[PDB]
Amino acid sequence: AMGSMERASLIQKAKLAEQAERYEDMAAFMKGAVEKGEELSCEERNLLSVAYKNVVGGQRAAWRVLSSIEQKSNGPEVREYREKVETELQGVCDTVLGLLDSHLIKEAGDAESRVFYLKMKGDYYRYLAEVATGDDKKRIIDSARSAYQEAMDISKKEMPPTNPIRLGLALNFSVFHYEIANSPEEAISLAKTTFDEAMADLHTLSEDSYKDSTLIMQLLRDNLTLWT
Amino acid sequence: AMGSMERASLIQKAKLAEQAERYEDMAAFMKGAVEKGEELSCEERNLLSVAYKNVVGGQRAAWRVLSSIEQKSNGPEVREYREKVETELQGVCDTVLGLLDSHLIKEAGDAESRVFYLKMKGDYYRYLAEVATGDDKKRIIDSARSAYQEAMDISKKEMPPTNPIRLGLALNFSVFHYEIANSPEEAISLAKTTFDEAMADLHTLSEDSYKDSTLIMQLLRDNLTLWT
Numbered sequence: 328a329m330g331s332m333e334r335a336s337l338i339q340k341a342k343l344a345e346q347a348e349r350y351e352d353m354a355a356f357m358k359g360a361v362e363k364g365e366e367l368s369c370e371e372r373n374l375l376s377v378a379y380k381n382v383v384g385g386q387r388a389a390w391r392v393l394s395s396i397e398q399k400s401n402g403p404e405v406r407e408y409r410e411k412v413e414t415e416l417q418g419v420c421d422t423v424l425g426l427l428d429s430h431l432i433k434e435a436g437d438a439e440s441r442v443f444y445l446k447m448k449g450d451y452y453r454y455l456a457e458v459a460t461g462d463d464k465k466r467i468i469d470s471a472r473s474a475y476q477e478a479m480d481i482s483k484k485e486m487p488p489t490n491p492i493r494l495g496l497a498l499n500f501s502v503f504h505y506e507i508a509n510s511p512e513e514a515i516s517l518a519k520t521t522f523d524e525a526m527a528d529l530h531t532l533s534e535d536s537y538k539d540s541t542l543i544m545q546l547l548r549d550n551l552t553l554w555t
Numbered sequence: 556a557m558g559s560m561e562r563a564s565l566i567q568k569a570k571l572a573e574q575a576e577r578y579e580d581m582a583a584f585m586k587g588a589v590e591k592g593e594e595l596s597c598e599e600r601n602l603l604s605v606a607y608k609n610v611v612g613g614q615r616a617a618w619r620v621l622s623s624i625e626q627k628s629n630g631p632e633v634r635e636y637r638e639k640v641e642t643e644l645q646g647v648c649d650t651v652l653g654l655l656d657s658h659l660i661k662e663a664g665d666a667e668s669r670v671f672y673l674k675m676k677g678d679y680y681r682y683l684a685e686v687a688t689g690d691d692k693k694r695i696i697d698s699a700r701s702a703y704q705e706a707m708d709i710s711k712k713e714m715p716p717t718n719p720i721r722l723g724l725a726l727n728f729s730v731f732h733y734e735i736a737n738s739p740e741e742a743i744s745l746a747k748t749t750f751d752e753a754m755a756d757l758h759t760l761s762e763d764s765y766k767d768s769t770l771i772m773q774l775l776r777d778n779l780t781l782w783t
């Protein structure tokens with residue numbers, strides 16, 4: 328439905344929607360921008376990610392509330408409404424994954440863009456895994472793992488240990504190991520090694536880069552504190 | 556779209572949606588419940604009001620952000636996106652006003668229900684007035700005034716000065732005078748008289764009623780502090 332709007336106007340409106348805290352609109356504008364077919368700049372990739380993380384975030388928070396109520400109840404209403412929210416969440420994840428597959432990842436040749444999009448792919452499969460059951464569920468978990476792993480492999484070859492996309496990827500992959508893969512030791516090892524190798528590279532940074540990197544290192548530290 | 560769901564299940568889901576902070580869903584469930592044609596109980600009237608106040612609240616907050624950006628800008632994008640949000644806000648207000656006219660107010664014979672719905676009518680015309688321009692605009696302002704006035708007339712005849720619906724009505728009508736009607740003296744007089752007559756009636760209240768009433772009296776006091 329954004330086919331008739333200029334790419335530049337979609338980006339401008341996404342920024343307005345962010346100011347207005349209208350994240351559903353923000354996501355729809357950025358989906359429209361991606362669907363123009365051109366690669367996205369760093370700033371535009373960040374608008375895409377912020378929009379969808381806020382949308383899916385509201386859904387995941389609601390799903391958690393409902394799932395809790397349902398499990399303590401264990402008529403059809405709680406299950407029905409949890410399933411409604413679950414389906415809408417699945418739809419948003421499928422939308423994002425669709426944008427990544429058609430055709431953001433395939434056209435992403437620079438490490439910053441390719442790692443960004445593979446991290447996003449890992450994150451949205453991870454959100455699908457949170458609500459998935461059984462077997463179907465193993466293939467979803469492995470899709471998340473596979474995307475994160477490819478991103479990690481590129482990030483380790485092509486980016487310094489303090490790069491904020493590399494740090495955020497490692498942070499989220501550690502969360503995947505702790506929360507999804509039942510691998511708390513792998514989570515803790517990854518968060519530890521990532522933190523230590525970033526610390527050793529801080530000396531190479533300007534003041535502003537240092538602020539960017541240490542912000543994410545503090546999130547790694549927060550998890551490690553929660554996990555140990 | 557809620558025609559096939561049981562009234563009781565719509566109410567139950569509205570309560571779940573409130574826990575989940577899913578206010579759009581909450582409003583749609585309560586719209587469905589109203590459309591069953593039966594009068595609403597006190598608790599159900601409160602669910603209706605909470606749902607729509609949160610929905611329109613998000614819209615009014617966004618509209619304010621956008622209007623500010625637009626007026627400081629004064630391409631078409633800011634105006635266009637402010638108009639989009641404005642139209643959606645107008646639609647929600649029209650929806651609420653429609654439920655009140657078809658047929659909540661006409662079937663409301665008790666003072667608690669009739670005052671509640673006439674206050675709501677004043678509030679949603681007030682939200683339309685916030686975004687309205689010119690003349691069209693005078694009739695909207697007078698519709699809000701007229702609804703609030705009828706509610707006030709009934710409330711003064713039928714409810715004690717500490718009743719929380721009477722207090723909330725007076726609070727909102729004072730806000731209408733200050734923000735919409737350019738009548739700050741009327742706003743201040745109304746808030747003052749309402750506060751003083753409630754204070755004089757507190758002695759008649761139980762501990763829990765006292766807590767309910769004094770909460771709203773503090774909002775009147777907060778406005779008076781802001782306005783004087």
Ligand SMILES: COc1cccc(NC(=O)COc2ccccc2P(=O)(O)O)c1
Pocket residue numbers: 380381383384385387388450498499502546
């Ligand atoms: C963004 O809104 C929500 C809703 C529900 C859960 C969360 N996530 C959290 O509270 C913590 O999640 C993380 C912590 C470190 C890295 C990544 C995440 P995640 O949100 O699971 O991508 C966020």
Ligand SMILES: COc1cccc(NC(=O)COc2ccccc2P(=O)(O)O)c1
Pocket residue numbers: 608609611612613615616678726727730774
């Ligand atoms: C509920 O979300 C919003 C969004 C934008 C504005 C507001 N309202 C306010 O900040 C203060 O408004 C009032 C104060 C006292 C009584 C009534 C109101 P109102 O929200 O204008 O019905 C609320």
Ligand SMILES: [Cl-]
Pocket residue numbers: 407408411568
């Ligand atoms: Cl449902």
Ligand SMILES: [Cl-]
Pocket residue numbers: 433434435436
């Ligand atoms: Cl490529």
Ligand SMILES: [Cl-]
Pocket residue numbers: 340635636639
């Ligand atoms: Cl628009």
Ligand SMILES: [Cl-]
Pocket residue numbers: 661662663664
């Ligand atoms: Cl009647």
Ligand SMILES: [Mg+2]
Pocket residue numbers: 333334
């Ligand atoms: Mg063009």
Ligand SMILES: [Mg+2]
Pocket residue numbers: 410413414
């Ligand atoms: Mg399901």
Ligand SMILES: [Mg+2]
Pocket residue numbers: 366434435436437
């Ligand atoms: Mg390329």
Ligand SMILES: [Mg+2]
Pocket residue numbers: 438485486487
């Ligand atoms: Mg490099």
Ligand SMILES: [Mg+2]
Pocket residue numbers: 561562
């Ligand atoms: Mg029935």
Ligand SMILES: [Mg+2]
Pocket residue numbers: 638641642
């Ligand atoms: Mg308009």
Ligand SMILES: [Mg+2]
Pocket residue numbers: 594662663664665
């Ligand atoms: Mg009746």
Ligand SMILES: [Mg+2]
Pocket residue numbers: 666713714715
């Ligand atoms: Mg009475």
